[PDB]
Subunit: 130 residues, 6 copies
């Protein structure tokens, strides 16, 4: 059962030279790249539609400022249970073995975003890959 | 308390060039290779005695076809709590940090098999290493 | 984004890299050498057109390989980027290099990097007008 | 919220050539080295003040003998939630993805020690870095 | 199993590799170069006999090392496998190679690879009759 | 601790290595070549003094870099350690080496290793009297 999920490689991954290292972990898990776009500086409006459900929260503007402070890469990966499986690779900073667990230490500069559900994926994918 | 467990490196590991990568993780955990046999194409009868407890299940024939579609390696590792420890390294595809968690994405082509118990180990070891 | 430099070069990550899951491995070596990405473009199957202009010099046989699977064109920036990355690409006989460590075929060699300032300019023009 | 924790790289890491591999995992998690001391052979009295809460336990002398059988490195790392985060990287031998999980197989020769609490950290840091 | 080629060579993964836990590291470099395994044999302690025939040319001192710990003999297949793998083995002074990156001793050098077509044939015969 | 040898050399892990989080990566390559650590010293900011004596030969510009961020001085021991580690350090153009794979600047080059027996002795004296 193939699925497609959207993944974002945040500006901090570029600053810390962890782009290849992050994509590699996903690649080694056997997921394929269907679509890919490189953003030297993603358009703010595009960032705000993506994080719109956090529109009423405190760090919304900062997270937005951050997502626009460096290049970004948006990828559409394809694979079996891709959405759930990749969301797990991403993990969290308190779980070693995952991407955020082994490489991140901030809840804002967390190197990567992966769709968390089917709806979220279809919406997220339509945003960066209309 | 030393133990010996049986490990199988499945055909997909060869197709995907992950043989060294899998053995390395076990090696780095400090387990030693006691016995090793390389099978360009393991004999089907040997495969069926090994998966005989699944003899009445749907994917039995397919899993069997798969295990005979490429080379295989059978290894007997030795170490403290080897059986339980290695079974954990193997893990599952939903748990990053483990072998199946970081490299597999199918419940059939799961790159590796590790004995799941003492009895299973003694029986499995007598099968590939009579 | 420190990486930045005094030279711009074109890199092509070939289909075989995708089939053998070495895309990251390859990009990692360049990234660790501290070169930055200026432009990047992914093609599920680069246009027959561009492949022809690029190698415009068994021509059709290789062209077929470069069009089979997907490719990624990248523009790297850094000091002496052209030469340095070329050395990273290396060849099938030189261990320590990308082709040296990961490839064993003169056509299916995983990656392409501009060999000269002239090449780089034309190559960047073909993939990034 | 920065914190400082104390970390010890045990003699076995040296024997097994895993010093860089262990420090690398901590480094990649983005923690910085504040202080560092290399001990060809740490002084026994220093080892006993550190493991003094185990003074009445069976393996106390052995663990002590071991900690003095090879070189050791004491490091003070600094980062956000450093104490808790690094304690997690260290993990245990039953949890792959962590340092002990991927590289250790003995509860004594466990390659690394990381402070387990703030008090433990302040005390441990005053011990090796008075 | 694409790897396949036009040449067959013999590799010996020495005891020190096992003691230093570099067996996988070593096999990985060859596997990433895309060479396939044809034959493989593990010896908890290769026969004194075979060690003698192999190096049949301080002879006894080295023979002792090759018989101390375990060894793994492997037959690799690929285009120009003999030469290519030999270059991967390299030497103690050449970084980027197996011996170059991982060894620092002329006897205890982790791995052996056939140096020529003739050698390869005889070596494969000794370990894989 | 087998590593041990017949030669002693001095290594400096520069500030850029810390900023780019390559300290372990660098130390790992030497450790895998099986060299052992004899002496080691971490400096949050090595003394202006020592930097001057070391390079005592734009002098002030480089001295500033070596004093900006932290550094780690290490004394490695092994057979032919001086030469061998020097080769591991290599240069910006040689892939497979530390500078070859990870650096792209003649000043900010991540690591320093004694180039000769004489150098090694003086360098070890400056950082480890």
């Amino acid at each position: 059962g193939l699925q497609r999920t959207l993944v974002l490689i945040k500006p901090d991954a570029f600053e810390r030279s962890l782009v290849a290292e992050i994509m590699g972990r996903i690649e080694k898990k056997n997921f394929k790249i269907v679509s890919m776009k490189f953003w030297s500086k993603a358009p703010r409006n595009l960032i705000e539609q993506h994080y719109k459900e956090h529109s009423e929260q405190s760090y919304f503007n900062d997270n937005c400022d951050f997502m626009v402070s460096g290049p970004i890469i948006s990828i559409v990966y394809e694979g079996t249970d891709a959405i759930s499986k990749i969301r797990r690779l991403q993990g969290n900073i308190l779980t070693p073995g995952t991407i955020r667990g082994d490489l991140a230490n901030d809840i804002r500069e967390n190197l990567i975003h992966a769709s968390d559900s089917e709806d979220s994926a279809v919406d997220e994918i339509s945003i960066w890959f209309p």
